[PDB]
């Protein structure tokens, strides 16, 4: 299957309360493998998966230097954007950055990303071509022009198509048992009488990896989204995920309805039906 490496950064200003909170996390696919937190004790980049613990002190020292430099960057960014938007010193603001790379089944480069939000909305992003920028407004045009003169896109393109992909392959080899697995969902159905006239059917998918899954209800063979409820896919806390989808149906007509489950670990999609 295809794979990704993504780094996520969040800097939050603290008016009257000192230095910003900064939190950085790194993922391969849906598995977290590193963090840095300004609130934590070590002030180092730290392991969060077993397979990365065997990297030596040169790796940790390097990652620590860089992540601290990313922290200082976003500390300055908070002040810069406050100035661009002429915002008061009174309020807390947020800068977020994500970057990383996708590779196909051949483990060859497919796509790269490097993008920012300010207070929860897009600010600037590197376009899919890795040569040009999308600026959300007139403030972000200032940053776009700056980054064009400093050839930021060229630098990012080199990392994204090179270093990013190289290390993602290294991590997939060395985290093999964890990262290259597929755990198919364990499925079942539950039922609640709502009244004499209605019932709820709930179709469950449990203990699956990776997180990507599709749960759909049909009635007589037809996709049915009226009177359905689909919860966000959620972590179990052991490395797997969970999801459910429910439908409210008229009493006695439960046999019309089918739950369909699609997942990488299932060689054929599953159909579930409820019987009394």
């Amino acid at each position: 299957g295809s794979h990704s490496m993504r780094y996520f950064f969040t800097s939050v200003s603290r008016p009257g309360r000192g230095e910003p909170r900064f939190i950085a996390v790194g993922y391969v696919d849906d598995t977290q493998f590193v963090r840095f937190d300004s609130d934590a004790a070590s002030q180092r980049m730290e392991p969060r998966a077993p397979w990365i613990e065997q990297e030596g002190p040169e790796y940790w020292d390097g990652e620590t230097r860089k992540v601290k430099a990313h922290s200082q960057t976003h500390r300055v960014d908070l002040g810069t954007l406050r100035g661009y938007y002429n915002q008061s010193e009174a309020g807390s603001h947020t800068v977020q950055r994500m970057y990383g790379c996708d590779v196909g089944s051949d483990w060859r480069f497919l796509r790269g990303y490097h993008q920012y939000a300010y207070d929860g909305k897009d600010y600037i992003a590197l376009k899919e071509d890795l040569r040009s920028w999308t600026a959300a407004d007139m403030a972000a045009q200032t940053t776009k022009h700056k980054w064009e003169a400093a050839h930021v896109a060229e630098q990012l393109r080199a990392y994204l198509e090179g270093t990013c992909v190289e290390w993602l392959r290294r991590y997939l080899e060395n985290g093999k048992e964890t990262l290259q697995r597929t755990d198919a969902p364990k499925t079942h159905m539950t039922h609640h009488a709502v009244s004499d006239h209605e019932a709820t059917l709930r179709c469950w998918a449990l203990s699956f990896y990776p997180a990507e899954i599709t749960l759909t209800w049909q009635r007589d063979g037809e996709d049915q989204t009226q009177d359905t409820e689909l919860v966000e896919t959620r972590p179990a806390g052991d490395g797997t995920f969970q999801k459910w989808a429910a439908v409210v149906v008229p009493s006695g007509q439960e046999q019309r309805y089918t739950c369909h489950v699609q997942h990488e670990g299932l060689p054929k999609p599953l159909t579930l039906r409820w019987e009394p």
């Binding site: 790194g26 790796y59 990652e63 960057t73 960014d77 920012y116 630098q155």
Partner: peptide
């Protein structure tokens, strides 16, 4: 690994 990235907005 992280990028060696220093660019500011």
């Amino acid at each position: 690994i992280l990028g060696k990235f220093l660019h500011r907005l």
